[PDB]
Design a protein around this ligand. Structure first.
Ligand SMILES: Cc1cn([C@H]2C[C@H](O)[C@@H](COP(=O)(O)OP(=O)(O)O[C@@H]3C[C@](C)(N)C(=O)[C@@H](C)O3)O2)c(=O)[nH]c1=O
Ligand SMILES: Nc1ncnc2c1ncn2[C@@H]1O[C@H](CSCC[C@H](N)C(=O)O)[C@@H](O)[C@H]1O
Ligand SMILES: [Zn+2]
Length: 404
């Protein structure tokens, strides 16, 4: 496969087998026919970009009934509001500032911008969550951001001072088109800022469930620096974030317009020192992934043989990789509890575990809950103290399989 950033050769290091769409939740009576694709991950030989080897077409993932609602997490709501206030205090202080968000979802970030009276536009090609943002008074276009739609916004609205994307840029294999988009639309002195799951964290935590249809790229500072530079931008800041299992927020500016913070060089040097993107490191990760599969299935089967009940918690997109790679279905984990109405009373993809409202996780509790939404551990466990007090325990598989 050719690298989507530079056209280099991509070498595979992990093959997770045949997988369903991660965000497709079927009614129980639907035909058992699903779209499947081969999920495998490689690294570009030339620019070090780690990326999937098969693309899922955008319209199969993102469309009218896409079910992920960002605002379902209190930690994320606070995280995005704070980011919005930071932009309002720094990059959006001009006379007539403009901010564009790629992937605004339900408006989790842009509601703060809208509440400050700042001109803005959200790109949200999934119309059901777009309408939730529009109900908050946010300006949203139900389109994918790409060269042409960026051109159209530049023609009608002028340059954006900030273009921001969270948990969205890594989903877009046509990143070159997005970057052309950014070049057409960003002010000469603006910034393109994006935050996504960090390769460093994935490798350290063996958090392979971060790999699924919607995560095409696993960005690093080294690869993002290369990608920027090849397109006339420059990586000028990096910030590590705890959300979503570990992320980096990357700040890109037009080349030479701003001087990189010391943080960029320091993270580049740590990745080079730790051999983050070396093929050998990435294969060692792939072998750790198999070890986690084998320990998790051994545990789940032992639990069953010992007459212990087991459910899951959080109908994450990520969990589709776990259940389908590991072969875990309703035999072993009888239900998954989730707060999203459009995932409730439906079956998880590929493995077909029933999803039930989180309100149903109550006395009498199961013996064990497999914590799919482990990136939300603290928020979830805080709301489920009674479960743990009653003696129920969590099963985690990041960074290793363990119960607590
Ligand atoms: C906080 C909380 C969540 N839950 C439930 C709600 C969600 O269905 C799921 C968590 O999904 P969560 O880890 O955020 O994203 P997912 O892996 O799906 O990934 C999705 C798809 C996507 C865009 N590709 C991505 O990268 C991230 C940003 O979002 O867990 C509770 O039940 N109780 C709670 O208290
Ligand atoms: N080319 C593109 N432009 C804009 N949004 C896109 C896109 N491709 C996918 N999306 C949107 O990207 C969103 C990813 S979900 C992440 C939402 C939010 N920023 C958060 O961090 O929680 C989805 O709502 C999807 O519809
Ligand atoms: Zn490349």
């Amino acid at each position: 496969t050719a690298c989507r950033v530079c056209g280099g050769g991509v070498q595979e290091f992990l093959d997770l087998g045949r997988q369903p769409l991660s965000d497709r939740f079927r009614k129980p009576d639907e035909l058992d026919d699903e779209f499947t694709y081969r999920l495998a991950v490689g690294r570009c030989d030339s620019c070090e970009m780690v990326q999937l080897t098969e693309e899922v077409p955008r319209d199969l993932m993102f469309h009218e009934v896409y079910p992920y609602h960002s605002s379902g997490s209190s930690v994320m709501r606070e995280h995005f509001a704070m980011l919005a206030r930071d932009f309002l205090a720094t990059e959006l202080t001009g006379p007539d500032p403009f901010i564009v968000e790629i992937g605004c979802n339900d408006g989790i970030m842009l509601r703060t911008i809208q509440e400050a009276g700042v001109r803005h536009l959200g790109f949200e090609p999934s119309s059901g969550v777009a309408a939730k943002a529009r109900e908050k008074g946010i300006r949203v276009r139900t389109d994918f951001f790409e060269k042409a739609t960026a051109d159209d916004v530049r023609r009608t609205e002028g340059p954006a001072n900030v273009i921001y994307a969270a948990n969205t840029l890594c989903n877009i294999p046509y990143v070159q088109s997005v970057l052309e988009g950014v070049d057409a639309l960003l002010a000469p002195d603006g910034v393109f800022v994006f935050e996504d799951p960090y390769l460093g964290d994935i490798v350290a935590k063996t958090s392979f469930d971060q790999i699924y249809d919607e995560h095409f790229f696993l960005f690093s500072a080294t690869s993002v620096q290369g990608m920027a530079q090849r397109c006339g931008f420059e990586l000028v800041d990096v910030q590590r974030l705890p959300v979503h299992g570990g992320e980096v927020r990357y700040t890109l500016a037009r080349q030479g317009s701003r001087t990189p913070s010391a943080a960029v060089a320091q993270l580049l040097a740590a990745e080079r020192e730790q051999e983050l993107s070396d093929m050998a490191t990435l294969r060692a990760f792939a072998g750790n992934v198999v070890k986690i599969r084998d320990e998790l299935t051994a545990l789940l089967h032992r639990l069953r043989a010992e007459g212990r009940s087991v459910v899951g918690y959080g109908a994450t997109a990520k969990s589709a990789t776990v259940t389908n790679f590991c072969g875990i279905g309703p035999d072993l984990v009888h239900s998954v509890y989730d707060t999203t109405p459009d995932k409730q009373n439906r079956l998880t993809p590929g493995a077909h575990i029933p999803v039930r409202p989180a309100s149903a996780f109550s006395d009498p509790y199961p013996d064990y809950a497999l914590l799919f939404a482990w990136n939300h551990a603290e928020e979830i466990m805080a709301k489920e103290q009674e479960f743990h007090q009653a003696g129920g325990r969590w099963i985690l598989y990041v960074p290793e399989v363990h119960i607590r």
